[PDB]
Structure formats: structure tokens, C-alpha cells
Design a protein around this ligand. Sequence first.
Ligand SMILES: [Mg+2]
Lengths: 239, 106, 120
Amino acid sequence: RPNDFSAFQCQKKMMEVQKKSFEEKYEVFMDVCQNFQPVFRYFCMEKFLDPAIWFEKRLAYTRSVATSSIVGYILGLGDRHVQNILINEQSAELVHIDLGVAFEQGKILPTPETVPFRLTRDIVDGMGITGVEGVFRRCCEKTMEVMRNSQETLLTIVEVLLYDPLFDWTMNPLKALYLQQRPSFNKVAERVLMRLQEKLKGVEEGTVLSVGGQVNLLIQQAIDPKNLSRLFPGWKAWV
Amino acid sequence: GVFRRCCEKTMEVMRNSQETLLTIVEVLLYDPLFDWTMNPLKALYLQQRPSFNKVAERVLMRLQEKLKGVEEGTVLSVGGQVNLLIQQAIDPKNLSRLFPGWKAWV
Amino acid sequence: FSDTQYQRIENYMKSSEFENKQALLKRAKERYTVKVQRELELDELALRALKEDRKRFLCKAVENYINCLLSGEEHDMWVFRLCSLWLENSGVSEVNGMMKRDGMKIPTYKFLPLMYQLAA
Ligand SMILES: [Mg+2]
């Protein structure tokens, strides 16, 4: 798309609106998204000319995205920007690196993260014409059913981890300042465990939800434009 | 027979109208003239043998948990909750530990 | 729906995550000074926006509850909510204004079930 906005132009536009109101941020984000269209669907098109292999790789990519999204939401993984996610050029599957921020510690940052996982326009565009309505939703539902059916073991594992003396998982001002740069412990651990136990059940905003309802809520929160416009420009919501 | 089914029906009614019940209890608990909290004098008078905001919030939280299936942290159906309540009410170990003035044997 | 959104915002402001974020900001307060001041400006702006959204949702919920009570008698039991949104927001001038203008058109008997709580 040579006629669209360049990445540098979008970054400059989004950085200069940080110290503004939310409607101005929203309108600038919508304008940027209007002149910046997803092109990720070509990744599998130019590497697998055989239609069968292309279909297999696209399906594998969609399943990997769904599983990673569900697992990361359960663990409260944060800081999922474009440089922290890799794609395999042979299997078209995603790998997540730089897992320092977890257990919803990204919501304590001065510019808090307001999404459960990264489901931007490129990620959805890489799934095909259907989008998130076919394989993605069913795979997310299956993964969430698996997580719900084994909640006791997950609570046990997270309890073992969170009380490890050498595991420095809580957010501190120095780490918060380093993460976002532009050019009692017992109570916290108990609250994190409580939030995780609520997550592994259907309790969202105090009401019990089914697997499908919880998946729908997560998906609609991840792709919400008002949520995307309010995040840190380094997260690159328009990408 | 009739007792368990009637308890289940009443609990279904209570569960289906939980928002209204929370609203009513919220209106009541913040009434300045409603003295519902326990105090040492009342505790001593009740059993004689010959911050407010945190307490109110906790009571509301417990009530909201009650009007759903959340008992001991797990979600229960109407029948399961009724069974748990019935088995707790008739439990001999529970009855033996209460105050003699309650007259558990009667 | 408006009451649901207002209650979500209120619960978020009453949550422990908000307290943790504020405590982290204050700990950062005590060339880090410029960055700390900038982040304080940002969180002040966020707090003002949150308060404005809460006020808007509360006003919409109150006015729609009053309209519903004026429309018919099938949902009289919801009056408990309206007073609950009023007695806890006596400082807000918009709620008092809406009450004074419209709620005086509501039939009086609908206020009988909670007459004990108003008089106190
Ligand atoms: Mg990195």
C-alpha cells in the first residue's frame, strides 16, 4: 500500500496527541486507521503457493493465535507489542518472548493497558475473510473450557510460583519508568490469586458467564477502538 | 417431599430477583437510624445463663454471594445450595455447639 | 444499562487496583522529577475524565428511572434504586435538579414502601 500513510507518519501523529483529550485521541486514531489498512494476510500468500499448504499454514496460525491469546489472558500477560511477538517462517506459528510483565501488572503502569491480549487489525486480517468468527472463536472456547476444567491445578501452580522469594513479578516505579519511555506484598499476592480464581470461573464484573460469553467479552474488549486509542503509542495499536 | 421443592422454588425466586434485593438491602443498611451491627452490650445481654462502612460493604458482598450460587467459593445450583443449607441445618455436630438457650434438642 | 455503566465506574474507583496505582504514583513522587510530574499530569487528566463519565452516566440513569416511574406502575419496585442513586449523590446538583423538576410529578404512593428511609 504505497499510497497509505507510512509507519513513521502514523507514529508521529499518535505521539503528538498524547497530551490531549480522549475524543481528540479517538478521532486521531480513527483517522490513522482510515489511512492505514492491514496487509498481513499476504504473509501466507507469498510463502506457500500451493493452496493446500497455504490453507494448513493459515489454520495453524489461527489456532496458535487463539491458544496464545487465551493462555496469556489467564496469566495476565502484558507488554505484547510488535517486537515481542515472533512468527515462524516455516510453520506460521507465533512465539511470545519478553514475558517480564505478567499477572495484570501492566494495568498499574501510568498509561495502563486496557486489553486482555493483542487482537489488532493485522492479527485478525491474517486469519482470512471470515476473521475471528470461525476457527478462532471455537479454538478460544475450547482452550477456555480446558482452563476452566483444570482450575484447581492452575491455582495450585500459581500459588507455588507467586510465593517464590526470587520471583520479582510486582511492578516498581523504576520498571514502570523504563517500560514507557518516549523519544504489602502478601495483600498483592492474595489479590492476584483472587483475581485469577475469578478468571478461571465465569465471574466477570461480578456476574457468572459461560465459556462462550466470556470469550465474546474478551474478543469485544480486545478489538474495541476506544480501548485501542487509549494505549501507549509504543504498543502500536494501528498495526 | 414438599419442603425441599418449596425451598427450591423460593430460592429460584430469590435468585431471579437478586438486583432488586441488593437495592433494597443497600437502601436499608445505610439508614442512619437502623442499628443493626452487634455491640458488646447486646452480645452480653443476648447470651446470659442463670469502621461501619467496611462492615456494611462486607455484608452486602456476602448477600450478593448468597443470592448467587457462590458457597465456599464454588458456584452451586438451586438444588445444590438447598441441599447444603438443609444438611447444615440438621447437622448434629452443629447443633451440639450452640448456646443451650437455643434449645437444640427441642 | 446506564446504572450498570455507572456502577462499573464506581467499582473501579473503589477497587484495590486503583489504590495500588495511586500508591505507585506517590512512591514514584518520593532527571526522574520531570517524568514523575508528567505522569502526575497524565493521571490527573485521567481522573477528571473518569469523574466526568461517572457524572454523565449517573445523570442519565436517574432521569431514565424517573421517566420509567412516570410511565407506568409495573416497575414501581425500582423506586428503591432511584432514591439509592439520590441519597448517595446529594452533593450533585444535577440529580437534585432532576428530582425537583420531574420526580414531583411521580405519584406519591410509590414512595410509601421506603418512607422510613426518607424521613431519617
Ligand atoms: Mg523485547
